[PDB]
Design a binder for these strands. Structure first.
Lengths: 228, 898, 228, 228
DNA sequence: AATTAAGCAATTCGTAATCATGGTCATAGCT
DNA sequence: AGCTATGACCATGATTACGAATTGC
């Protein structure tokens, strides 16, 4: 089996949120936050024949990048991972699936209370300003019928009353109103154009970003307000 | 001359006591003492306990019987009182009254062994043979020097007094001839006769008190180990007066410390004495360094390995040993320490070694005082060590304050003890504690009006005096009486001196003079008619009386200053954690209270508001800033600096001092304390020279300040003198040359201004390269090099000077030079780029010199710049930047951008 | 306001000299440092229309580089700074005039005592190599009838004698002789050609490195000597 | 002097071997490990006319790379090194010849037991994987009649029985057997195609990598075995 | 057999670990 | 061939802890 460059990039993006991962057979890749505040999944074009728990994923992608994409991954003789190349052989141990934190099954996403789209440039600039403005809280809401996102520093501004950053995403023609608070560390998505869905039930609330390769699900702060 | 004890010991159930008779002969005896303790009794008895409960005496035929009784008594968990240490009880019963002593009845022995070998003589090993011994006896005032002629490490010729008295340029040793006039030489070709002669001299001339420079460090252990390994056990046993010499090996974490106690003789070291009563730390603690510091006397310098000195010059070897013992005796004579401990022990009636612990002497003196008032001493109860809060310290603003006035309390802790009337028995209970900041502002209500309270939250009995305050009053009264005697004797001596310089008489009969009294004018006129010899005899008698009075007063001062450390300790007999916590908490409360009051009064007089005039301070000492008062009056009206000094002196003495006093009267009113005692006094006056752009004074942090003092107490200084405290000048760590130049720089900033600082900085910069390598080195201290010793290279978290020590040991292992150990200050030096040793620092014993094979290598790679910036530039920058000064003119675009 | 990228870079250098700045309306910028030994002025292509003070210029310039150049900058309704983009808006707190050190007024540099020219390559070499050899201080003096520079290391050579680095500057036809010494720390001009105008009188002179994009002013050290 | 940038690269790769270096007159450059397990030699097309020993090679090669390539090198009037380009002259200090570990003479080493050839990219890949997997050591051996290299870690696999990485040099022409163990802290060679030369007698052994510019000699470890 | 013995608050430097910050050569990219 | 942007690497600085050392109330 071989992993294409896009698959390597996607799993690199996925390592940004969880230390470990499960490699299940097929063409589906899953990952969940270690504290379970964020979720992600994707579909690859490579057929997987075996499942393996990986703990040091960043090193794994580093060593994979150093070799050509035609290298084969197999089950080693000692219950571990073997990488076979034309002239080089690597033995990377397989971690215990018990200790690796991952979902036991895919989680379908229910109907969305709110629907909009976000451009790649929007994601890039918001992540960059979050780094630069050392933001910790983002309040996604609707102002003047426009679904927008604002940035608030919860530690300094516990009342989120000072809009240091703002960005308009789309036009929402609905009396439904909402304001969802999210921590930055949940935001680990790779750059790209995405579609944003919001779904909340009372105290419960969640968001979902869908892209052409991978999808993410983000938990919300309990202080979020909403009337649907 | 009444009999007084010299030494006391316990053997079996008998007490061996060596002492002096009426005519002055040292003799011993044994007494089968009869222990007599007390136990709690319901029946009314004359001897009641501390709280007034009756105590019935109980007598035993032996110490062992009393000990077993106490064991079975503590087994049933019932309280039994009395004095546990039967030695103290016996020695108190034997004498009871005061003791009058003489220094000619006590044998002070100052010994020293010089031994050569290929490696440092280890007392644990005791491998080499003692080829030089010196033993000075005080009563004979004679040095006994024994030299080994033939040894496996070398054979030498016989020592000469005349040659040792010759000059070095003439091949001599420059030993003072008055010393060899008191020197007896017993050379021996063989070690056996040497050892036998020393043993029998020890037995015939048995010293009452044995002391020496780090004696228990090497002198005692090595001798006893050698005699043990050469002549089995009887050798060491017979050294002891009663065949009782005991090993007390203190195996610390790093190494081993064999301690040998010769029972019947008060084995007391002298290095610890200088490290306990002198209150001054030198860059080195070698005998040569302290001798140079005390007697200015410099032994003829020697270059090379000590052991190899014998093979080149035996005469100078013996000369050095003799002069070093002489220096020990001389520093003791000028300091007056052995007499001090003897006076303390005789005053408190306890074994000599009891001087080593303030707990012991305070316990003994309180036992004596309570026996005088017919009370019963309670037994000691178990406790656990707990760290109560300590002394509050202000945080000064690191801004250079021009005018600072110092004020202080005199003997704060005893004054608190007596004023609050605190004692383990006076405890009555606790009150509802209020937040401290209420008390500091005088807002919390009165905790009680029937018992003396303490802001730690307690109330203790009123009216009734506390026993500890009783003894404090006793010692204070004795101290002031002795000081008045001192003043009287000083006046008598001055009057006799002025009479002599005016003219003497012609009466050759010496009259009787009453000691410790002031001479009347008629008495002086009578004494003016005597011959010069009689006048000189009276002068020397008065001087000796003054010395005895000084010893008494200083012993009292040590006692009072040590009582605070005595009270808080688990092993102490009258220990009471609540009492000590009360004392320290009350101290903090009082100092913060007076701090707030001072700020209030200074805001009132100066007219400003919420201004922190109190510069800084800690317990019993507060420095305030009063430059605003000077601005209010103005500097122009003062024609001379002394005018300003006397003006601020009068202002301190007459204007705020009554305010401090009335504030403390109000304090004692607020509290229920027995009696107001916190007398505050002005301490020192700090001010810059008039007209000079100097700064006057500054600080750096808590307990860190430099103040140009013009009049400390009332002793007006013609020129101002600096009282630097805490800074790198006082620190031993700073190199001597850097220390002196830094001190000059500090004087320049305080007095002249910035420009002098910069000029002297440049001068020191250009001189520092061409300085002697001996006077530029951090000294620090090596403790447990083994903890960081790992195969000639530094270990994990290796301290800097220890790294240098390891480098030096790498350099000179196998070179047979003096090695570096714990306690020995190790002067370090930095090494630049590629050094042959292989590391950036090298460290050698303080005072010592490097042997010439490595001297060139070290001087070729001394990193001048790094040391110059990490020892002199950095602290100087800290000081000046704390004082708004720059040592190097930097300038800016003020010419144009301004 | 719109700040062109060249103005951003110039502001970045003016940040390197001083982390804070104040600015008045116009196109002329003037910034000092806290120590007062450095000054700088310039005339940017753009024009400032509202006075404002910025405390942390590094993040300011970073976030402005993150956003589009066309995005307008102005003073916010609350007295702070607001930047509007095509889809986003950012807010930054306004630094008070007292909390940021600022130069008082434009500096009237007097008639130059001496003048020369330095090319960009030589200045770049000096700045890049003074760190390699720990060349703390530089001296510009008259050697064999020509003005030249040489590097002296202060930390080890307080006497200013050990010649380590030495660069020929150019001709100097003047009977006057001078030995100006300059701390490398104040040598912070942006890489480029400069005309040195050196002045001195009494005990304090100055050096003006003038260039097409800005002019820098550096104080001289007391060791600097001159004879006219 | 006039050293090509290739000469500078060789010097820089030599600096990672030993902190300092000597410079004999001629076209020959060599140095050796401080512990003596590694030695490097090379022929330089540039000409050296005088000898000088320097301890701080890295800084020197850095500043030399900093100056214009046309510059010339000579020995100073004060026994230092002076390098001068078109406008600037620099004085880099010279060192006491005692401090530098100076190899007395190159090792000719004519004969050896085994020979093979390793490609540049394979060497690069194995160095990178050794960096990634903390592979402290390798062993060149023969299995299934194949010259191969297997990497292991001592601090974890003290017995060196479990292989963590494998690379096959190729087939073995001879029939002799061996297994030479080489610590990875020795590998400092420039990335390039090399010819590998293995020799071993009794206890001692040697591994050489020959390149178009420089050759490297390293000593095998105490567990290296050989029978021919 | 004696129990084995001033107290606490404070300041400074070096080491070490550890992260964050920043040039910089290394790498992918368009003119 | 050269400016432009990105990127880990390596240096370095800043912090913070810790221990060792030393006064002074």
């Amino acid at each position: 089996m071989k992993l294409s460059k896009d698959t390597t990039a996607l799993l690199k993006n996925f390592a940004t949120i969880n230390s470990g991962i499960m490699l299940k057979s097929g063409q589906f890749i899953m990952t969940r936050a270690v504290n379970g505040t964020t979720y992600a999944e994707a579909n690859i074009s490579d057929v997987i024949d075996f499942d393996v728990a990986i703990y040091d994923l960043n090193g794994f992608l580093g060593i994979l990048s150093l070799v050509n994409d035609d290298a084969e991954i197999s089950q080693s003789e000692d219950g571990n991972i073997k990488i076979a190349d034309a002239r080089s052989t690597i033995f990377w141990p397989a971690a215990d699936p018990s200790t690796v934190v991952a979902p036991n099954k895919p989680i379908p996403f229910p109907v969305a209370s709110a629907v909009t789209e976000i451009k790649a440039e929007d994601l890039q600039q918001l992540l960059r300003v979050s780094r630069g403005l050392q933001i910790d809280t983002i309040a996604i809401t609707v102002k003047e019928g426009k679904i927008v996102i604002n940035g608030f520093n919860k530690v300094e501004d516990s009342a989120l009353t000072r809009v240091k950053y703002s960005l308009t995403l789309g036009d929402y023609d609905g009396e439904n109103t909402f304001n969802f608070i999210i921590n930055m560390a949940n935001m680990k998505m790779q750059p790209g154009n995405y579609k944003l869905l919001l779904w909340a039930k009372g105290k419960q609330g969640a968001a979902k970003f869908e892209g052409e390769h991978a999808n993410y699900v983000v938990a919300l702060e309990a202080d979020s307000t909403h009337d649907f | 001359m009444k009999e007084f004890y010299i030494s006391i010991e316990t053997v079996g159930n008998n007490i061996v006591e060596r002492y002096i008779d009426e005519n002055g002969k040292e003799r011993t005896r044994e007494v089968e003492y009869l222990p007599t303790m007390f136990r709690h009794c319901k029946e009314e008895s004359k001897y009641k306990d501390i709280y007034g409960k009756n105590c019935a005496p109980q007598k035993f035929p032996s110490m062992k019987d009393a000990r077993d009784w106490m064991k079975r008594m503590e087994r049933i968990g019932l309280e039994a009182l009395g004095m546990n240490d039967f030695k103290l009880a016996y020695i108190s019963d034997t004498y009871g009254s005061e003791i009058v002593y003489d220094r000619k009845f006590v044998r002070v022995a100052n010994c020293d062994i010089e031994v050569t070998g290929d490696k440092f003589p280890d007392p644990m090993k005791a491998e080499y043979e003692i080829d030089a011994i010196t033993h000075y006896d005080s009563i004979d005032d004679r040095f006994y020097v024994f030299d080994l002629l033939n040894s496996m490490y070398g054979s030498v010729s016989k020592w000469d007094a005349k040659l040792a008295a010759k000059l070095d340029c003439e091949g001599g040793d420059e030993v003072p001839q008055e010393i060899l006039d008191r020197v007896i030489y017993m050379p021996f070709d063989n070690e056996r006769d040497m050892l036998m002669e020393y043993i029998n001299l020890w037995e015939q001339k048995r010293p009452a008190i044995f002391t020496g420079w780090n004696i228990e460090g090497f002198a005692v252990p090595y001798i006893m180990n050698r005699v043990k390994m050469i002549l089995g056990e009887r050798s060491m046993k017979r050294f002891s007066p009663i065949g009782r010499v005991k090993s007390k090996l203190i195996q610390n974490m790093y190494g081993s410390k064999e301690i040998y106690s010769i029972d019947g003789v008060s084995i007391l070291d002298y290095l610890d004495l200088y490290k306990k009563f002198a209150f001054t730390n030198l860059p080195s603690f070698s005998l040569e360094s302290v001798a140079q510091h005390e007697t200015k006397k410099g032994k003829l310098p020697y270059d090379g390995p000590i052991n190899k000195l014998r093979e080149t010059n035996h005469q100078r070897y013996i000369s050095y040993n003799i002069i070093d013992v002489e220096s020990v005796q001389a520093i003791d004579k000028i300091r007056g320490f052995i007499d001090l401990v003897l006076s303390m022990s005789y005053y408190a009636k306890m074994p000599f070694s009891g001087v080593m612990s303030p707990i012991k002497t305070w316990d003994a003196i309180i036992f004596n005082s309570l026996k005088g008032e017919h009370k019963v001493i309670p037994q000691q109860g178990s406790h656990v060590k707990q760290s109560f809060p300590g002394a509050f310290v202000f945080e000064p603003k690191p801004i250079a304050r021009r005018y600072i006035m110092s004020f202080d309390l005199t003997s704060l802790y005893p004054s608190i003890i007596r004023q609050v009337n605190i004692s383990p028995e006076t405890i009555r209970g606790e009150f509802e504690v209020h937040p401290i900041h209420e008390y500091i502002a005088g807002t919390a209500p009165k905790p009680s009006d029937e018992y003396s309270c303490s802001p730690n939250g307690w109330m203790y009995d009123k009216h009734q005096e506390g026993i500890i305050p009783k003894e404090i009053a006793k010692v204070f009264f004795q101290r002031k009486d002795w000081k008045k005697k001192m003043f009287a004797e000083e006046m008598n001596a001055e009057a006799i001196k002025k009479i002599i310089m005016k003219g003497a008489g012609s009466c050759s009969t010496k009259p009787e003079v009453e000691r410790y009294v002031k001479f009347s004018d008629d008495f002086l006129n009578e004494l003016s008619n005597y011959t010069e010899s009689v006048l000189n005899s009276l002068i020397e008698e008065c001087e000796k009386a003054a010395t005895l009075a000084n010893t008494n007063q200083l012993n009292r001062k040590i006692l009072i200053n040590s009582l605070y450390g005595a009270l808080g300790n688990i092993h102490f007999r009258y220990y009471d954690l609540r009492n000590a916590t009360a004392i320290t908490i009350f101290g903090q409360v009082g100092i913060q209270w007076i701090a707030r009051k001072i700020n209030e009064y200074l805001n009132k007089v100066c007219g400003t508001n919420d201004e922190d005039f109190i510069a800084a301070g800690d317990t019993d000492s507060v420095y305030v800033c009063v430059d605003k008062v000077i601005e209010k009056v103005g500097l122009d009206r003062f024609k001379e600096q002394n005018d300003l000094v006397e003006f601020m002196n009068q202002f301190g003495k007459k204007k705020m001092e009554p305010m401090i006093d009335v504030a403390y009267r109000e304090l004692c009113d607020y509290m229920n304390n027995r009696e107001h005692l916190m007398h505050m006094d002005r301490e020192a006056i700090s001010c810059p020279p008039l007209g000079s752009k100097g700064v006057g004074g500054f600080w750096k942090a808590k307990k860190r300040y430099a103040l140009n003092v013009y009049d400390m107490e009332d002793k007006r200084f013609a020129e101002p003198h600096l009282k630097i405290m805490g800074m790198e000048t006082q620190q031993s760590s700073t190199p001597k040359a850097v220390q002196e130049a830094l001190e000059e720089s500090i004087r320049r900033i305080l007095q002249e201004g910035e420009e002098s600082v910069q000029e002297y900085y440049k001068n020191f910069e250009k001189e520092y390269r061409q300085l002697d390598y001996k006077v530029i080195a951090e000294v620090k201290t090596a403790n447990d090099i083994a903890k960081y010793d790992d195969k000639g290279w530094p270990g994990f978290k290796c301290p800097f000077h220890i790294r240098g020590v390891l480098t030096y040991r790498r350099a000179v292992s196998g070179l047979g030079v003096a090695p570096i150990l714990d306690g020995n200050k190790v002067m370090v030096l930095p090494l630049r780029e590629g050094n042959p040793f292989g590391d950036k620092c090298i460290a050698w014993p303080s005072g010592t010199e490097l042997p010439k094979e490595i001297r060139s290598d070290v001087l070729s790679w001394i990193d001048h710049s790094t040391l110059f910036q990490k020892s002199f530039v950095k602290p100087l920058a800290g000081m000046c930047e704390s004082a708004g000064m720059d040592y190097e003119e930097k300038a800016s675009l003020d010419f144009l951008f301004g």
